[PDB]
Structure formats: structure tokens, C-alpha cells
Amino acid sequence: NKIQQINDKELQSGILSPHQSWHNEYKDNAYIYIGNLNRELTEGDILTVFSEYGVPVDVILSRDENTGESQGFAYLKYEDQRSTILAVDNLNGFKIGGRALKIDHTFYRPKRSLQKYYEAVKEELDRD
RNA sequence: AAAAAAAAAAAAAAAAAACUAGAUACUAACACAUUUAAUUUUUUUUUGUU
């Protein structure tokens, strides 16, 4: 609802196409921060809503090291960037499970401690 | 220009109020297009990763 507020102003001026859009600030980014998730949605189900706008190559759900349950945020890289422009813009502010999730562009830095979680995820997304 | 008179009835201290609706004049240099670049409507069960 912070970002959703911008695009309405922006589109109203007829900004139309990325060169003039703030989404142009990125261009080298693909992962999207996915916020305000519900707690029970897992990686496979976050890999439900987000293929509407593209083809995910990677995904990471943030979850406590001990109890292993959702922190409530994820980082999902689309194969073709412009999905990111599409997901951030279009699906931000949308309700799942009563709470409206947030998306925004992100630069994502991998953490050693999850290293196995990368192949464990990749192998599934490597199936396709 | 100009040269009077005379025969014992009256007097007066100068319409409202209320009700309900309608009719028309009028009063305040009243206000009538700019208003928006520091500052509080922005609210949620804390939860954005070398």
C-alpha cells in the first residue's frame, strides 16, 4: 500500500513503459521480497501465486533456524526479469489468508548457513 | 404718489399582542479560484537476507 500508492500517481501522469518508471532503477534485479505472508504458506504454495507473472528459477522462504517455521518473508527470482516489474506492481496489496502481502524489488545476498537449502530447493525447480 | 379708526357665538396645549405561513426591500469593501515543498488520518497481530 506504500508501493500501490505510487503506481496510481505514476500511471495517472501517463508514465507508461519502464524508462520513465521507477521500476527502471533496478533492471539488474530479479528476486522479489515477499512480505506479510501468512505463517502456514510454504515454498510450494508461494510457488503457486507467483507463476502467474513468470517462471521462477529460485525461491527462498525465511524461517527460524530452530523451530523451522515461516518468518513470513521470501525471496523469489523470476527467470525473465520483467516478471518482477509485473509481480511487484500488479500483485502488491493482495489478500491471502486475511493479510495483504507486500512485494518489492530486492538485491538478494545468499547466506552460507542455508547452502544445502539451495540445492534442496533448486533440485525441485531444476526438475522443470 | 400716498394723509387712518369707534354706533356697547367660541376653545383640541398639536389599536395592540400572540400564532402560523406567505409577499418584497435591504444590510457586512462578508465569501466566490486558486489552494500544494519542511512537519502528524496513514492505524495491525515487532519482524527485509554476507
From Swiss-Prot:
Residues 30-108 form the RRM domain. It comes from Saccharomyces cerevisiae (strain ATCC 204508 / S288c) (Baker's yeast). The keyword Lipid metabolism does not apply. This is U2 snRNP component IST3. GO terms for cellular component: cytoplasm; nucleus; precatalytic spliceosome; Prp19 complex; RES complex; spliceosomal complex; U2 snRNP. Required for pre-mRNA splicing and spliceosome assembly. As part of the pre-mRNA retention and splicing (RES) complex, required for nuclear pre-mRNA retention and efficient splicing. Required for MER1-activated splicing. PANTHER family: RNA-BINDING MOTIF PROTEIN, X-LINKED 2. InterPro entries: Nucleotide-bd_a/b_plait_sf (IPR012677), RBD_domain_sf (IPR035979), RNA_proc/Spliceosome_comp (IPR051847), RRM_dom (IPR000504), RRM_Ist3-like (IPR045844). Disruption phenotype: Cells have a slow growth phenotype that is exacerbated at 37 degrees Celsius. Deletion mutants have a significant pre-mRNA leakage at 25 degrees Celsius.
